[PDB]
Structures are given as structure tokens and as C-alpha cells.
Structure 1
Amino acid sequence: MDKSELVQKAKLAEQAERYDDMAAAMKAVTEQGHELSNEERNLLSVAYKNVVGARRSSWRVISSIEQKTERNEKKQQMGKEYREKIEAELQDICNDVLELLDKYLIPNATQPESKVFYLKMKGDYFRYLSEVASGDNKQTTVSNSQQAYQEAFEISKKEMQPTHPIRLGLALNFSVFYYEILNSPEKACSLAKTAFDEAIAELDTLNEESYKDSTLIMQLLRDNLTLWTSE
């Protein structure tokens, strides 16, 4: 099967709600090593969001049942083994995505918006590993998660306008990450305020017909600031 055929197969699998097929199709597309179109990039992102989402969902369901269980019914030990089977798949799916990002997507990215998309995706997929990571492996995945967002963060700052909706929103994502996962409320606030203020300073340059493309995300940065400072 060639790229055109795989892409079509991918859209058919989406329609049929067969997301693993959809993901396998777009994995193979990605492996031709060429920069993906917006259509293709969207398809891959969707494909894997859904495949990863289903196991995450299954895992939340099992963890919850495990904790309502009486703690030596040999049933309890099914929920252990089963959760662990889910986890291993979840990690397998994540490793695929990360391999694609390391090997093809990030290195071939020619434009800064694509490079930032893929770096953030890498950040997101490490975050999913961390949700089922063990003790000492859990700090590794969070650092790997931070570093990917940091790298994307730096590129937006350097290649995009303060007012750009991807830069904002990466600012938002990254600030929330410092707050929610790294327990750093002061860095979280510092980050948000800087993003907010920088875009504020260039409100000047926006078109009255589409300023909300920027303004809506800035409102969220601001909302978080007042929320986080109120604590």
C-alpha cells in the first residue's frame, strides 16, 4: 500500500471508528519520512489520541474497581494483572508515537509551527507514560515531558509573534504543567504573566475582525493568574 492508499484507509477507519487501523495506517504514512500535510498530521493526532484514550479510559475504570475491592479476594489479583496488561499496551502505544516523533516528525519539521506541534505531542505522550509509570521511572517521564514542552516553548518564543495563538496556549499548556504536575505555582504564574503581558503589548497589531483568535486564550492565561494568586 502506498501513501495515498494509506491516507484513504486512515479516513475509512476513522469513519468506521476503527482507530487502531487508523493509527497503523498513519504510522506507515509517517514512516515514508516526508513532512506530513495538515490533513495527514491531523489524522495521525486524532488516530493516536483515540487509541491512547481508550486504554487510558480502560485503566481508570480498572484502577477504580481495584480500589473498591476487598484486598485479598483472588478477584483483586485479576484487576492487578489486567490493569498491568492495559498498562503495557498503553506504554507500547506511547513508545510507537515517541519513536515516530524522534525518528521522522520532529527532525524533518521544516516550519516552526510543525516543530512545535510535534514537540508538544512528545510532551503529551510522555505525560501519558507518566500516568502509569512506576516510582523511579515516573520522575524520568515527567522530566522528559518537561523538556519536550520546554523545547517547543523556546521555538514559539523565538519564531512566533507573542500574539500567535500557538505560542499562547503553549504558554497556557506549559504554565498549567508547572502548576499541576511540577507543583511550581510561582514559576507557573511567572510564565503565564509573561505570555499574557507580551501579547497585551502587541494588541495594537491585531485585526478587529479576528482579534479573538488571540484574545480568548489570553483571557485563560489571565483567569489562571487570578485563580492561582487567590491561593
Structure 2
Amino acid sequence: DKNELVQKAKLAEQAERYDDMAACMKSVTEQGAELSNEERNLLSVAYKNVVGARRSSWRVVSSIEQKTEEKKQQMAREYREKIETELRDICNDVLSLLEKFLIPNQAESKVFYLKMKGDYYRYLAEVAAGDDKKGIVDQSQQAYQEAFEISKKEMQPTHPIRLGLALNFSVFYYEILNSPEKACSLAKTAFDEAIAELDTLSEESYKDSTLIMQLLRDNLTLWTS
């Protein structure tokens, strides 16, 4: 039953080991049910952490390779490729689950899954090479576009999902597209729109929204710098 699977995932989360959390949430979702915001949040936490550890590793290894002046560099490249294949496999594992069960099925839900798709394509873009780097980003912008449309039409600017879209889409614009002006425009738009509801935020989302806006302000400083 889905309830027991959700409980086992929760247990893995508490144990602070996420691979089994993700592997349990994967089979929770294969039931084709609409994941409620709790299990949805658990699924996001699970795959985000599972990929994040590999992401850090990749960045570190890429830095070491660049620090090379040989079998040393060859080996570094090979480890990097191993990490990337692992990260690619997990991202594909998530994207196919969303495409086969979550994205085929509320506006908020729609936007969350589409944003997730975009972000996973973006994590691929961080590791991608060749002309397909464009195809990966293309599919990411496609999802982010559907997310931005659904959110602009059915999400108040107070919604954390609507802000996360702009924040990540802007990160995409600066890190993948090297367009700081494109990033700062959408970011400032979202930031001022949230400020237009600065006192309208919910008791919990005040902290959520302000944290997102703080990160927005910081990366805005970075891209303007």
C-alpha cells in the first residue's frame, strides 16, 4: 500500500540517507496516484539530495582537472565521466517518472512537476557536452515555459512555486545561457511582484518567500557584478 511506502521513505529521510528514500518514492508514484504535497515534497527532497551529492562531486572533480597541468588528468577525466553517468542515470530516472505519471496528472501540481523537469534538465546541462547540450536546455525551457504560463495564470505572486520557477529559470539564464540581463529582468519582476504582496503572505510562507527573495537579491548582486 502507498501509506506504508510513504512511511518507509519518511524513515529513510529521518535516517538521513536518501537513496532508499528515492527508491521507495519511485514505487509509490508508479501507482499512478496524484502525490499529495507531503509525499511530493518528500520525493523532491529525495531526488534533490541524491543528485546534489553527485553535483558537488562533479564540481570538485572538474576543478581538480582544471588544476592539472598524463595519467593524472586521464584518471580525473574518467572519474568525472563516472560521476556524470551516475548523475545522468538518476536524472533520466526522475524525468521518465514525471513524464509517465506526474506530468500526465491541479495547476499547482502541474507547475511543481514541470518545474522539477526543468531543474533536472538543468542539472544535466551542468554536466552536458556537444550539440545535445542545446536539446537538454530546450526541453528545460519548454517545461519552464509551461510552468511560467500555468503559474502566471493560476498562482498568486505569493506562491513559492511561482518564485522558484523564476529563480531557477534565471539561474539557467546566467549559468547555461550567460545572459545576466535576461536573468535579472525576470528575477526583479518576480521580486517586485512578491513585494506587491509583501504583507499578504501566509504565516509560514513569510519566511519561505523572504528566503527565496533573499537568494534572488544575492544572485541579482552576483549577475549585476
Preserved CA contact (<8 Å) 2:158 2:201? no
Question: Residue in 1 aligned with 2:200?
Answer: 206
Question: Residue in 2 aligned with 1:139?
Answer: 134
Question: Aligned equivalents of 2:204 and 2:159: distance in 1?
Answer: 12
Preserved CA contact (<8 Å) 2:6 2:39? yes
Question: Aligned equivalents of 1:187 and 1:210: distance in 2?
Answer: 31
Question: Aligned equivalents of 1:50 and 1:224: distance in 2?
Answer: 22
Q: Residue 107 of structure 1: SS of its match in structure 2?
A: coil
Question: Aligned equivalents of 1:104 and 1:157: distance in 2?
Answer: 24
Preserved CA contact (<8 Å) 2:125 2:176? no
Question: Residue in 2 aligned with 1:4?
Answer: 3
Pair 1:167 & 2:166 matched: no
Q: Equivalent residues in 2 for 1:122-133 (5 A)?
A: 122-133=117-128
User: Residues 1-51 of structure 1, C-alpha deviation per residue, up to 9 Å, x if partnerless?
Assistant: x32222222122223333211111010001111011222111111111111
1:104/1:199 CA distance change after superposition, 3 Å? same
- The Cα of 1:129 is off from its aligned counterpart by 0.7
Question: Residue in 2 aligned with 1:77?
Answer: 74
What TM-score do the two structures reach when normalised by structure 2? 0.83
The alignment-based identity, stated in percent, is 84
Q: Equivalent residues in 2 for 1:41-80 (5 A)?
A: 41-70=40-69, 72=70, 74-80=71-77
- Bigger drift between 15-24 and 161-170 goes to 161-170
User: Residues 168-200 of structure 1, C-alpha deviation per residue, up to 9 Å, x if partnerless?
Assistant: 343333334334432333433432344345455
Kindly report structure 1 stretches of 4+ aligned residues shifted beyond 6 Å. Answer: 207-211, 222-227
Question: Aligned equivalents of 2:79 and 2:194: distance in 1?
Answer: 48
The total of aligned residue pairs comes to 224
Aligned AA (1:77):
Q
- The Cα of 1:107 is off from its aligned counterpart by 1.2
1:196/1:103 CA distance change after superposition, 3 Å? same
- Bigger drift between 216-225 and 129-138 goes to 216-225
Q: CA RMSD in A?
A: 2.9
Question: Aligned equivalents of 1:163 and 1:13: distance in 2?
Answer: 32
Question: Residue in 1 aligned with 2:101?
Answer: 104
Aligned AA (1:67):
Q
Question: Residue in 2 aligned with 1:90?
Answer: 87
Preserved CA contact (<8 Å) 2:160 2:205? no
1:119/1:59 CA distance change after superposition, 3 Å? same
1:115/1:211 CA distance change after superposition, 3 Å? closer
Question: Aligned equivalents of 1:218 and 1:180: distance in 2?
Answer: 19
Q: Residue 81 of structure 1: SS of its match in structure 2?
A: helix
User: Residues 110-155 of structure 1, C-alpha deviation per residue, up to 9 Å, x if partnerless?
Assistant: x211111111111110011111111212111122222211111111
Question: Residue in 1 aligned with 2:17?
Answer: 18
Question: Residue in 1 aligned with 2:143?
Answer: 148
Preserved CA contact (<8 Å) 1:163 1:214? no
1:117 aligned residue (112, 130, 133):
112
Preserved CA contact (<8 Å) 2:126 2:176? no
Question: Aligned equivalents of 2:13 and 2:109: distance in 1?
Answer: 23
